[PDB]
């Protein structure tokens, strides 16, 4: 999920952008 | 764009942000 | 738009606090 | 919807937690 | 209503900062 | 509501929205 | 205080609330 | 109050520090 | 004022997110 | 400048960028 | 004046409040 | 810079002041 991949990890724009409807 | 841990309300600004028009789940911890 | 937009950043603020591990969507289009 | 709802008059935390989930 | 709501958000932020360990009241009925 | 260390400014807005018309008091670090 | 008990610790909403006038 | 002096114009942090303690 | 003041709030912390480490410049008079 | 652009009209993340460094 | 650790967008708005009509310049890392 | 200075340490109000333009 987003947390396990931006916050406990550092996210790129592009990999946030998976999480827009 | 930040190289940086966005966790909690941060997160969800820069989703917000990202996101525009579109608009956003956020499922929180999965 | 800006007002509604500044608005919508305190909302998502707020639901993020109050919605919890459960989350939620945002959305209206 | 949220947003006509809470930006025009303010939405208590109450309120807000409607659109949660 | 929600404009000087999202108003008092930014000020309790504010007072956060400027007012550290000194805390701070926030009230007005 | 969250599961969260609520600290600094987020332990504040989290205060503010809590607390609604009554209004709180902030005396940080007892 | 609410540092001690909301930040050192994790608070219910109930423990937050304790801190409203 | 503070609201009516500074959500009305721009209070600086010496105008807000008056609201401290 | 305030909301010209408030709107800033918001455009200064969405700037740190879309700049990173070049950073910006927040100025105008 | 961004404030009267980014102030009346909501400006993306691209329109910000134009603002970077 | 606080005596914390202002990191990220805490930094940011910080500087934001404190320069007023100034404004302000954000190196990020240096 | 700002960061090692008010970030990785603490500042002082007059420290961060020396990033106003
Ligand atoms: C109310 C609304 C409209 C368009 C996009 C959104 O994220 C929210
Ligand atoms: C918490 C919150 C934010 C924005 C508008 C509201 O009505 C309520
Ligand atoms: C100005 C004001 C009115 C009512 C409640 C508050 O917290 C603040
Ligand atoms: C710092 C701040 C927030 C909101 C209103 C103001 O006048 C000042
Ligand atoms: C991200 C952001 C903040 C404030 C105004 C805007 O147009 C955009
Ligand atoms: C647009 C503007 C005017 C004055 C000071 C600022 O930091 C920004
Ligand atoms: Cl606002
Ligand atoms: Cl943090
Ligand atoms: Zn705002
Ligand atoms: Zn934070």
Do not use: M, P, W
């Not at chain 2, 941060?10 to 499922?27: I, K, N, P, Q, S």
Request: proline letters at 0%.
């Amino acid at each position: 999920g987003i947390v396990e991949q931006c916050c406990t990890s550092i996210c790129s724009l592009y990999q946030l952008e998976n999480y827009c409807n | 764009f930040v190289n940086q841990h966005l966790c909690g309300s941060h997160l969800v600004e820069a989703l917000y942000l990202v996101c525009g028009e579109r608009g956003f789940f956020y499922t929180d911890k999965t």
